[PDB]
Design a binder for this molecule. Structure first.
Ligand SMILES: O=C(N[C@@H](COC(=O)[C@@H](CO)NC(=O)c1cccc(O)c1O)C(=O)O)c1cccc(O)c1O
Ligand SMILES: N[C@H](CO)C(=O)OC[C@@H](N)C(=O)OC[C@H](NC(=O)c1cccc(O)c1O)C(=O)O
Ligand SMILES: [Fe+3]
Length: 174
């Protein structure tokens, strides 16, 4: 119940010329970091997928599919376009008990291989933040992973708060 403080938004770059149409589709979480994320070598974090779908109103339908307790859970929420392109807020925030704020900032992406996305939420008055290294495939170059590690560290996170989920085939394919 001690959190590393969220960084100031100045330390989180924004992906320039964000193309919402090109960001659509399935992304694999090849890297995950955050002040509430901890490496667990006893029971390692399994890889999951997050699928982005533009609706007519240009807001995203965001579905995360995860393999947990031998079934696939489906975490659904809406990302509403924020102050500038590549920046979002959470739609229908009142339906999530405790949530007072939620921010999404796409830091960098080339749209067809990889992406880094910054998340910040204030839940039960506690300020959580996270970065995900998204991949179009389950594997990415060690270079991109090291860059993700360097970015996470630049935001105050030590490497025991930086995990690389293990590739799986259940649920996240198809
Ligand atoms: O399942 C995920 N989480 C938890 C959510 O519980 C929480 O600790 C408080 N959460 C929010 O109130 C929240 C609200 C809206 C959006 C969110 O992201 C929230 O976390 C869960 O459902 O088990 C999840 C999966 C994939 C990716 C994620 O980022 C997840 O959180
Ligand atoms: N189900 C998967 C793990 O199998 C999962 O929820 O991990 C993703 C991660 N973002 C997360 O939700 O874990 C920590 C959790 N959430 C965050 O730290 C978090 C932080 C910033 C933005 C978010 O949407 C978050 O969910 C928490 O508050 O304890
Ligand atoms: Fe979450």
């Amino acid at each position: 119940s001690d959190l590393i403080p969220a960084p100031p938004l100045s330390k989180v770059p924004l992906q320039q010329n964000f193309q919402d149409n090109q960001f659509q589709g399935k992304w694999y979480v090849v890297g995950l970091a955050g002040n509430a994320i901890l490496r667990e070598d006893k029971d390692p974090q399994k890889m999951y997928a997050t699928i982005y779908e533009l609706k007519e109103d240009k807001s995203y339908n965001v579905t995360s599919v995860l393999f947990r307790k031998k079934k696939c859970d489906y975490w659904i929420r809406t990302f509403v376009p924020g102050s500038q392109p590549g920046e979002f807020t959470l739609g229908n925030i009142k339906s999530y008990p405790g949530l007072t704020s939620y921010l999404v900032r796409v830091v960098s992406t080339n749209y067809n291989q990889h992406a880094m996305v910054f998340f910040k939420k204030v839940s039960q008055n506690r300020e959580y933040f996270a970065i995900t290294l998204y991949g179009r495939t389950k594997e990415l170059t060690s270079e991109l992973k090291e860059n993700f590690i360097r970015f996470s560290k630049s935001l105050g996170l030590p490497e025991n708060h930086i995990v690389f989920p293990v590739p799986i085939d259940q649920c996240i394919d198809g």
